[PDB]
Amino acid sequence: IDQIELHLHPKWQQEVILNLRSAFPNIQFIITTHSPIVLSTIEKRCIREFEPNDDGDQSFLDSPDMQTKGSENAQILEQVMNVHSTPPGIAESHWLGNFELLLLDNSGELDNHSQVLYDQIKAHFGIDSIELKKADSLIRINKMKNKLNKIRAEKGK
Amino acid sequence: MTKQYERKAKGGNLLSAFELYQRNSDKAPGLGEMLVGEWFEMCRDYIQDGHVDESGIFRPDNAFYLRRLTLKDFRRFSLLEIKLEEDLTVIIGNNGKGKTSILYAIAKTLSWFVANILKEGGSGQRLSEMTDIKNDAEDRYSDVSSTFFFGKGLKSVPIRLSRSALGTAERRDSEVKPAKDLADIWRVINEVNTINLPTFALYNVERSQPFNRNIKDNTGRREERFDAYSQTLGGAGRFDHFVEWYIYLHKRTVSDISSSIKELEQQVNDLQRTVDGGMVSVKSLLEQMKFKLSEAIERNDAAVSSRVLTESVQKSIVEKAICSVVPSISNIWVEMITGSDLVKVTNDGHDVTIDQLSDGLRVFLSLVADLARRMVMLNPLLENPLEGRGIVLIDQIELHLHPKWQQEVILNLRSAFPNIQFIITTHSPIVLSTIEKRCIREFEPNDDGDQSFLDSPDMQTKGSENAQILEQVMNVHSTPPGIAESHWLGNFELLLLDNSGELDNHSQVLYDQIKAHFGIDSIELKKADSLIRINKMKNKLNKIRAEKGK
Amino acid sequence: LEIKLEEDLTVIIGNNGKGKTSILYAIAKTLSWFVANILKEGGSGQRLSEMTDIKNDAEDRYSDVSSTFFFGKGLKSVPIRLSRSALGTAERRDSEVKPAKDLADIWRVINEVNTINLPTFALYNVERSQPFNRNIKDNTGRREERFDAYSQTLGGA
């Protein structure tokens, strides 16, 4: 079967391999795919991984180092398929990294540009977004660590 | 009669000026030439007028796009309305939800535009009665409605396509008169003084076709401007027409007029100097040669006289589109060394022909190549023909593409084709991670066709990650439910939560089994260690609180 | 390239232009000999083409596809080699398919003496997802014939 995930929603990719291997238990299936959701139902020993930087001169075709059966699809996408979970072509992806870099570039406290970009993150992702949740957790951790560093360096002289 | 028509034409409406143009076209020439000329020139300024922005991209002042679609008793839908976006609209949902059906309805609507641009009083495609009518529908007829927008002059272009059942004996009619009027003004201003026409293209999932190199019967002329409307809304792109057109561009960067002129004339003159005594027994070949020379001295005069872009800059613009959108390809050419004129592409490294490509780097190549070809033929008066108006319907844009290249397919398409309104359907969260929430029209999973409004998701998908988009927008879990190994972290969470937080025998053997299945460098084992130490931290804080007070 | 396919399920992953379709196509060309010699005595399966199968940078101008099958402890190795030389070359390379001929001849002979269960070889390429028309019904082959089950079982859809 070449590209078993053809035209299938990622809800029927979670069970296509299990259904096929339960109905046809003695057929040897040899299958190609581009989907971490299909790979999440397949053992690591059943996977033959092509390296991204090969020229066709490799003498073997090997399994990954990560057990994919039962793993998260984002973890399989990052590790097995060598693909970012969050896209690098979108400038809105690196906003949280630039935000925490700006927080460390300050004294750990919020200033004008970091507050503007945090409001940008707020108005982009929304109230219940986990990007905002990680952003406010970063604010809490760095802002309280400022007072920790101050109270430890007061007695250090 | 025309006293308020002149004011309506001066106010920024082109239909009234078109009516005065049509009334004064068959009037007395000479003295009446100036008024019909200035109203025609006003219509041409309204169509052609636009400006480059600060980004260097041509933006027309009067854009053309579909803005609202209504399906009544059409296929699985009872009554549904979609407010489509100006630039990108993504339709997502489960299998058998109706996303290939919305694109089919929009293609049936745009077929009338294509047909009435092509021919005066042409008839486009219409709805079927065996499939398009809703089963167990009490009305026994279906219709689709579109409300196209063509600037401030035409705020609404209402088109209805109706069809009754196979034997219900009704005469439901399609309202295609504003489509007729808009395509008729496009055709008449084009034939008087050529204008940049809009493109319409449908790329259904039956563009995954085996490539046959020759298959060359292809009835029609591949250089004529109204060949970009030939089989455009029919599923597969005409990649065979593209490769013949590209071969003709390669052999028209000097070496085809050479063939039509020099060798044909020299064969004809050799026969003419042979037959100076007459003698039909070799004069038989000569009349065939002279007729072939006449046939090739046609199909060239229009190519020189009706030429706005030169025949090499079209090739350069098409190559720029290919190597800008399609990721692995970096150069594309035609080589004639063999004598079969074969097109070759450059992957990462090696130079291979089009037969030896993949089936996801060739299908996407055929899509981009056909769309760039149709825009180059249909938009000759621009410095970049890909900054042209149109509507393109792509069905499952993420077809046969690796998730590395689904992260940039939409960005490349919307960066190379800025003025196309794309109306796509996807099945992948990698593609939706690069698309804003307002461009997404989802179907709920608990849907049976009675809904009347497709709405955006509640979370922003642009810049979000695959796990969160897949769990909240696709509404499917990251860990698969069918794999019993995927519930072990949750079971470990419950067998820690019910106890105080110390590892008992069952929690210890579950930790050992999680470690043995996943490994030592796994997110599941790291998360289990984090839960163990935060529950020990909870117990330590509770013991310190109990020692402090009671 | 050397592949160590699993007994039950094997999944081949990688980018586009890595050769997974080529691997499945090579296996289908190998299994066509088994299918054709199950149907007809002295039959011939498909063979590698001269235009696409040979590498464009091959210095030897021939291509080999060497498969090794397993049929129990009694017959542990069934070798089969599909070889093809380049077009316009005086040197010609033959294919050694004799163990495949022997095994499929055995299957056909035992079947025609006393009816046995036959293995199911199938390829499901991207060549599927063609549109369905109910009106195409006229065909030759008598669909209820058991050996009609091998009718176009490989080659795509």
mmCIF file of N, CA and C in Angstrom, chain B residues 394-452:
data_model
loop_
_atom_site.group_PDB
_atom_site.id
_atom_site.type_symbol
_atom_site.label_atom_id
_atom_site.label_comp_id
_atom_site.label_asym_id
_atom_site.label_seq_id
_atom_site.Cartn_x
_atom_site.Cartn_y
_atom_site.Cartn_z
ATOM 1 N N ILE B 394 -8.848 24.868 -5.079
ATOM 2 C CA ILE B 394 -7.929 23.748 -4.897
ATOM 3 C C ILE B 394 -8.542 22.763 -3.916
ATOM 4 N N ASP B 395 -8.665 21.511 -4.328
ATOM 5 C CA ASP B 395 -9.213 20.465 -3.479
ATOM 6 C C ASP B 395 -8.066 19.654 -2.900
ATOM 7 N N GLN B 396 -7.915 19.718 -1.572
ATOM 8 C CA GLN B 396 -6.886 19.013 -0.804
ATOM 9 C C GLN B 396 -5.486 19.407 -1.287
ATOM 10 N N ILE B 397 -5.144 20.661 -0.964
ATOM 11 C CA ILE B 397 -3.877 21.282 -1.356
ATOM 12 C C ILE B 397 -2.668 20.502 -0.836
ATOM 13 N N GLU B 398 -2.811 19.832 0.303
ATOM 14 C CA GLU B 398 -1.781 19.020 0.937
ATOM 15 C C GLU B 398 -1.660 17.607 0.346
ATOM 16 N N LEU B 399 -2.125 17.399 -0.887
ATOM 17 C CA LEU B 399 -2.072 16.095 -1.539
ATOM 18 C C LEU B 399 -0.640 15.672 -1.839
ATOM 19 N N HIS B 400 -0.273 14.491 -1.336
ATOM 20 C CA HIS B 400 1.000 13.797 -1.553
ATOM 21 C C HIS B 400 2.213 14.592 -1.079
ATOM 22 N N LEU B 401 2.027 15.581 -0.215
ATOM 23 C CA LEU B 401 3.113 16.443 0.222
ATOM 24 C C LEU B 401 3.560 16.051 1.620
ATOM 25 N N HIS B 402 4.869 16.085 1.835
ATOM 26 C CA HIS B 402 5.427 15.810 3.143
ATOM 27 C C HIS B 402 5.084 16.971 4.079
ATOM 28 N N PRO B 403 4.961 16.710 5.388
ATOM 29 C CA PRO B 403 4.673 17.800 6.337
ATOM 30 C C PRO B 403 5.726 18.899 6.396
ATOM 31 N N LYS B 404 6.943 18.654 5.906
ATOM 32 C CA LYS B 404 7.929 19.720 5.789
ATOM 33 C C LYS B 404 7.491 20.756 4.761
ATOM 34 N N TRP B 405 6.853 20.309 3.679
ATOM 35 C CA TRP B 405 6.448 21.196 2.597
ATOM 36 C C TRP B 405 5.005 21.668 2.707
ATOM 37 N N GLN B 406 4.187 20.998 3.523
ATOM 38 C CA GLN B 406 2.904 21.578 3.905
ATOM 39 C C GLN B 406 3.055 22.823 4.772
ATOM 40 N N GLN B 407 4.197 23.000 5.445
ATOM 41 C CA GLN B 407 4.442 24.212 6.223
ATOM 42 C C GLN B 407 4.653 25.451 5.363
ATOM 43 N N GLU B 408 4.838 25.302 4.050
ATOM 44 C CA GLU B 408 5.127 26.443 3.201
ATOM 45 C C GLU B 408 4.392 26.451 1.867
ATOM 46 N N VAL B 409 3.538 25.454 1.591
ATOM 47 C CA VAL B 409 2.746 25.452 0.355
ATOM 48 C C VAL B 409 1.819 26.674 0.257
ATOM 49 N N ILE B 410 1.135 27.030 1.351
ATOM 50 C CA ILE B 410 0.189 28.145 1.331
ATOM 51 C C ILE B 410 0.929 29.470 1.233
ATOM 52 N N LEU B 411 2.062 29.577 1.930
ATOM 53 C CA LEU B 411 2.865 30.793 1.903
ATOM 54 C C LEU B 411 3.425 31.055 0.510
ATOM 55 N N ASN B 412 3.928 30.007 -0.158
ATOM 56 C CA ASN B 412 4.427 30.154 -1.523
ATOM 57 C C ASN B 412 3.313 30.501 -2.504
ATOM 58 N N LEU B 413 2.142 29.863 -2.364
ATOM 59 C CA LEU B 413 1.031 30.126 -3.278
ATOM 60 C C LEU B 413 0.508 31.551 -3.134
ATOM 61 N N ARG B 414 0.312 32.009 -1.899
ATOM 62 C CA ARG B 414 -0.192 33.355 -1.669
ATOM 63 C C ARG B 414 0.872 34.430 -1.844
ATOM 64 N N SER B 415 2.152 34.064 -1.898
ATOM 65 C CA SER B 415 3.183 35.037 -2.227
ATOM 66 C C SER B 415 3.417 35.159 -3.722
ATOM 67 N N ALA B 416 3.168 34.099 -4.492
ATOM 68 C CA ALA B 416 3.350 34.195 -5.933
ATOM 69 C C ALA B 416 2.085 34.569 -6.685
ATOM 70 N N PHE B 417 0.902 34.336 -6.111
ATOM 71 C CA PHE B 417 -0.370 34.665 -6.753
ATOM 72 C C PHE B 417 -1.127 35.578 -5.795
ATOM 73 N N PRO B 418 -0.815 36.879 -5.785
ATOM 74 C CA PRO B 418 -1.331 37.740 -4.712
ATOM 75 C C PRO B 418 -2.802 38.086 -4.844
ATOM 76 N N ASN B 419 -3.336 38.159 -6.061
ATOM 77 C CA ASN B 419 -4.685 38.658 -6.281
ATOM 78 C C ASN B 419 -5.711 37.558 -6.528
ATOM 79 N N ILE B 420 -5.286 36.297 -6.605
ATOM 80 C CA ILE B 420 -6.219 35.174 -6.578
ATOM 81 C C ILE B 420 -6.898 35.078 -5.223
ATOM 82 N N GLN B 421 -8.223 34.966 -5.241
ATOM 83 C CA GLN B 421 -8.963 34.469 -4.092
ATOM 84 C C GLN B 421 -8.904 32.947 -4.137
ATOM 85 N N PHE B 422 -8.172 32.349 -3.202
ATOM 86 C CA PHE B 422 -8.074 30.900 -3.109
ATOM 87 C C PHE B 422 -9.175 30.372 -2.202
ATOM 88 N N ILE B 423 -9.873 29.351 -2.671
ATOM 89 C CA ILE B 423 -10.945 28.706 -1.921
ATOM 90 C C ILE B 423 -10.547 27.238 -1.838
ATOM 91 N N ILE B 424 -9.869 26.864 -0.761
ATOM 92 C CA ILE B 424 -9.263 25.547 -0.662
ATOM 93 C C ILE B 424 -9.942 24.746 0.439
ATOM 94 N N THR B 425 -9.757 23.430 0.373
ATOM 95 C CA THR B 425 -10.104 22.508 1.445
ATOM 96 C C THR B 425 -8.844 21.760 1.850
ATOM 97 N N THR B 426 -8.672 21.516 3.152
ATOM 98 C CA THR B 426 -7.510 20.795 3.661
ATOM 99 C C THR B 426 -7.960 19.666 4.578
ATOM 100 N N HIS B 427 -7.047 18.714 4.802
ATOM 101 C CA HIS B 427 -7.240 17.644 5.776
ATOM 102 C C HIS B 427 -6.105 17.582 6.792
ATOM 103 N N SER B 428 -5.285 18.625 6.903
ATOM 104 C CA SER B 428 -4.069 18.510 7.692
ATOM 105 C C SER B 428 -3.913 19.697 8.631
ATOM 106 N N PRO B 429 -3.364 19.486 9.836
ATOM 107 C CA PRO B 429 -3.133 20.619 10.744
ATOM 108 C C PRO B 429 -1.847 21.372 10.471
ATOM 109 N N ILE B 430 -0.921 20.778 9.716
ATOM 110 C CA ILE B 430 0.320 21.449 9.351
ATOM 111 C C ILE B 430 0.019 22.629 8.434
ATOM 112 N N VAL B 431 -0.923 22.448 7.505
ATOM 113 C CA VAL B 431 -1.335 23.526 6.611
ATOM 114 C C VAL B 431 -2.116 24.591 7.376
ATOM 115 N N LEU B 432 -3.013 24.172 8.279
ATOM 116 C CA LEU B 432 -3.790 25.124 9.070
ATOM 117 C C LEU B 432 -2.942 25.910 10.053
ATOM 118 N N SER B 433 -1.761 25.409 10.416
ATOM 119 C CA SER B 433 -0.887 26.150 11.314
ATOM 120 C C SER B 433 -0.286 27.396 10.675
ATOM 121 N N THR B 434 -0.368 27.533 9.352
ATOM 122 C CA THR B 434 0.100 28.709 8.633
ATOM 123 C C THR B 434 -1.043 29.588 8.139
ATOM 124 N N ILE B 435 -2.273 29.319 8.566
ATOM 125 C CA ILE B 435 -3.465 29.987 8.055
ATOM 126 C C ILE B 435 -4.203 30.615 9.229
ATOM 127 N N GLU B 436 -4.590 31.880 9.069
ATOM 128 C CA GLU B 436 -5.280 32.637 10.102
ATOM 129 C C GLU B 436 -6.657 32.027 10.375
ATOM 130 N N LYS B 437 -7.137 32.209 11.612
ATOM 131 C CA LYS B 437 -8.407 31.640 12.063
ATOM 132 C C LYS B 437 -9.591 32.142 11.242
ATOM 133 N N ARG B 438 -9.551 33.404 10.807
ATOM 134 C CA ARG B 438 -10.659 33.990 10.058
ATOM 135 C C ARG B 438 -10.829 33.396 8.665
ATOM 136 N N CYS B 439 -9.833 32.678 8.151
ATOM 137 C CA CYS B 439 -9.892 32.069 6.832
ATOM 138 C C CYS B 439 -10.408 30.639 6.860
ATOM 139 N N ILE B 440 -10.804 30.130 8.022
ATOM 140 C CA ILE B 440 -11.162 28.729 8.192
ATOM 141 C C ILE B 440 -12.667 28.633 8.387
ATOM 142 N N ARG B 441 -13.320 27.804 7.577
ATOM 143 C CA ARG B 441 -14.745 27.514 7.710
ATOM 144 C C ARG B 441 -14.872 26.031 8.035
ATOM 145 N N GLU B 442 -15.143 25.703 9.290
ATOM 146 C CA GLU B 442 -15.145 24.310 9.703
ATOM 147 C C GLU B 442 -16.555 23.734 9.720
ATOM 148 N N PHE B 443 -16.616 22.410 9.628
ATOM 149 C CA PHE B 443 -17.824 21.646 9.894
ATOM 150 C C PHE B 443 -17.680 20.994 11.260
ATOM 151 N N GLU B 444 -18.709 21.123 12.091
ATOM 152 C CA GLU B 444 -18.718 20.440 13.373
ATOM 153 C C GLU B 444 -18.833 18.929 13.153
ATOM 154 N N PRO B 445 -18.263 18.112 14.048
ATOM 155 C CA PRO B 445 -18.392 16.655 13.877
ATOM 156 C C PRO B 445 -19.800 16.129 14.100
ATOM 157 N N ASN B 446 -20.622 16.814 14.889
ATOM 158 C CA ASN B 446 -22.013 16.413 15.106
ATOM 159 C C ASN B 446 -22.962 17.111 14.133
ATOM 160 N N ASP B 447 -22.643 17.029 12.845
ATOM 161 C CA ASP B 447 -23.372 17.730 11.799
ATOM 162 C C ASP B 447 -24.056 16.729 10.878
ATOM 163 N N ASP B 448 -25.325 16.993 10.563
ATOM 164 C CA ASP B 448 -26.091 16.155 9.648
ATOM 165 C C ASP B 448 -26.704 16.945 8.493
ATOM 166 N N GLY B 449 -26.209 18.155 8.239
ATOM 167 C CA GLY B 449 -26.619 18.935 7.091
ATOM 168 C C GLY B 449 -27.640 20.017 7.359
ATOM 169 N N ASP B 450 -28.167 20.112 8.577
ATOM 170 C CA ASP B 450 -29.181 21.110 8.893
ATOM 171 C C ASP B 450 -28.611 22.467 9.293
ATOM 172 N N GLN B 451 -27.295 22.576 9.458
ATOM 173 C CA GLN B 451 -26.679 23.842 9.824
ATOM 174 C C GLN B 451 -26.746 24.820 8.656
ATOM 175 N N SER B 452 -26.731 26.114 8.980
ATOM 176 C CA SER B 452 -26.938 27.148 7.976
ATOM 177 C C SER B 452 -25.828 28.187 7.945
#
